[PDB]
Write an enzyme that holds these catalytic residues in place. Structure first.
Site, PDB file in Angstrom:
ATOM      1  N   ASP A  25      24.075  16.290  21.028  1.00 50.43           N
ATOM      2  CA  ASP A  25      25.349  15.612  20.892  1.00 50.43           C
ATOM      3  C   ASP A  25      26.250  15.646  22.092  1.00 50.43           C
ATOM      4  O   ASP A  25      27.017  16.547  22.342  1.00 50.43           O
ATOM      5  CB  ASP A  25      26.007  16.325  19.691  1.00 50.43           C
ATOM      6  CG  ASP A  25      27.160  15.543  19.166  1.00 50.43           C
ATOM      7  OD1 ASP A  25      27.550  14.457  19.632  1.00 50.43           O
ATOM      8  OD2 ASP A  25      27.790  16.005  18.195  1.00 50.43           O
ATOM      9  N   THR A  26      26.344  14.624  22.936  1.00 49.01           N
ATOM     10  CA  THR A  26      27.199  14.496  24.102  1.00 49.01           C
ATOM     11  C   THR A  26      28.658  14.344  23.739  1.00 49.01           C
ATOM     12  O   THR A  26      29.532  14.389  24.594  1.00 49.01           O
ATOM     13  CB  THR A  26      26.854  13.259  24.931  1.00 49.01           C
ATOM     14  OG1 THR A  26      26.825  12.064  24.126  1.00 49.01           O
ATOM     15  CG2 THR A  26      25.476  13.318  25.558  1.00 49.01           C
ATOM     16  N   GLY A  27      28.978  14.163  22.475  1.00 48.84           N
ATOM     17  CA  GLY A  27      30.334  14.022  21.958  1.00 48.84           C
ATOM     18  C   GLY A  27      30.901  15.327  21.456  1.00 48.84           C
ATOM     19  O   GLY A  27      32.039  15.436  21.009  1.00 48.84           O
TER      20      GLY A  27
END
Ligand code: U0E
Lengths: 99, 99
Positions: A25-27
């Site tokens: 998850d880059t968020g």
């Protein structure tokens, strides 16, 4: 590996002697795992996401092996709906976003 | 572009005549943008994340330019903290995860 996004980007982690699947998850600025048993001490904390705020415990200097790759960092353990590998560990296994 | 993860992967999008900044979020199936002015009809829908559930309105077939690339897709508009581009649009601009 090159991971395409037609499917959730899920990966096997070994954390604290236990095999788990987690989403890349880059968020997420942090790594949050659903409730588990971790050896050690932990400080209470609250993180924010989409439908509010959860209370989690943080643990520092936890060894986590992500897709064969070893990383050491802070892991937040608490009531997330899914295991989340955020950017504090994604930059350690060198992961990037390309388009 | 190659985006490294030391800083939030934040990008300019143009949507509905409007300029915005959105986070590239591989942990999001869907695209959720802060409450804004969008022409057309929509349907009440609800999604979850960490913290709980939110009610969003669903707009299908909206044109978006993400780091100046164009894609057409469903766009949910509601109480989210940041603007998120999710896997429905990231697969459209050819975005992959590399490690
Ligand atoms: C659930 C299950 C599935 C998967 C998921 C993932 C998610 C994500 C999203 C994001 C957005 C932005 C919302 C989030 O939420 N993220 C978070 C993570 C956690 C941690 N902590 O890391 C973040 O990052 N958060 C933050 C906060 C900020 C905001 N603000 C306010 N609220 N105020 C911190 N730092 O914490 O991808 N998904 C979804 C869909 O949601 C989970």
């Amino acid at each position: 590996p090159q991971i395409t996004l037609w499917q959730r980007p899920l990966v096997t982690i070994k954390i604290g002697g236990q095999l788990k699947e987690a989403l890349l998850d880059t968020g997420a600025d942090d790594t949050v795992l659903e409730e588990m048993s971790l050896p050690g001490r932990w400080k209470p904390k609250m993180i924010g996401g989409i439908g509010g705020f959860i209370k989690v415990r943080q643990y520092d200097q936890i060894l986590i092996e992500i897709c064969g790759h070893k990383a050491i960092g802070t892991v937040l353990v608490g009531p997330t709906p899914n295991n989340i590998i955020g950017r504090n560990l994604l930059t350690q296994i060198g992961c990037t976003l390309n388009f």
